[PDB]
């Protein structure tokens, strides 16, 4: 005698925006911006190298502290602040370019 038609209508509502003054609210909505961090380096699956005191560029010249990684191979490289590419004092000409080249070397 009266058959009708309708939809969801949850009780509370939600937040989301559109191209208006916040526009509307909806029944269900999820997040898109990730705020959760892991204060570690999740290295499982990747062959990882923790260079430590070996400056990355050192792996080319071979100071003492880099003798560990003279012919290393890895998918993830972790530079540490304590590293240094030299033993006898001196700089690397166009150093950061060589670093960028080396981080994608495997």
């Amino acid at each position: 005698d009266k058959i009708c038609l309708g939809h969801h209508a949850v009780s509370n509502g939600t937040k989301v925006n559109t191209l208006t003054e916040r526009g509307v609210e909806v029944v269900n909505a999820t997040e898109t911006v990730e705020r959760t961090n892991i204060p570690r380096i999740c290295s499982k699956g990747k062959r990882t190298v923790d260079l430590g005191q070996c400056g990355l560029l050192g792996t080319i010249t071979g100071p003492p502290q880099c003798d560990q990684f003279l012919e290393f191979s890895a998918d993830l490289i972790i530079e540490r602040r304590e590293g240094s590419d030299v033993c006898y004092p001196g700089k690397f000409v166009n150093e950061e370019a060589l670093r960028q080249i080396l981080r994608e070397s495997g």
């Binding site: 939809h7 969801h8 209508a9 949850v10 009780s11 509502g13 939600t14 937040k15 989301v16 925006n17 509307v24 609210e25 909806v26 029944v27 269900n28 909505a29 999820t30 997040e31 898109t32 911006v33 990730e34 705020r35 959760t36 961090n37 892991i38 204060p39 570690r40 380096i41 999740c42 290295s43 499982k44 699956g45 990882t48 993830l76």
Partner: protein, 51 residues
């Protein structure tokens, strides 16, 4: 060596099945796109009209 992640930065690892992140703009890897907003909510349903 037992957790699995593909987006890294100075503060650690960002694991996320989401499109955007808010941790660090300088993050490297297969990261989400850094945005300035704390939160952006997707649809994911119909408009709500109570009874």
């Amino acid at each position: 060596a037992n957790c699995e992640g593909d987006c890294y930065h100075s503060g650690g690892t960002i694991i996320s099945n989401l499109p955007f992140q808010n941790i660090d703009s300088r993050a490297v890897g297969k990261c989400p796109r850094y945005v300035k907003q704390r939160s952006l909510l997707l649809a994911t349903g119909m408009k709500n009209v109570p009874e």
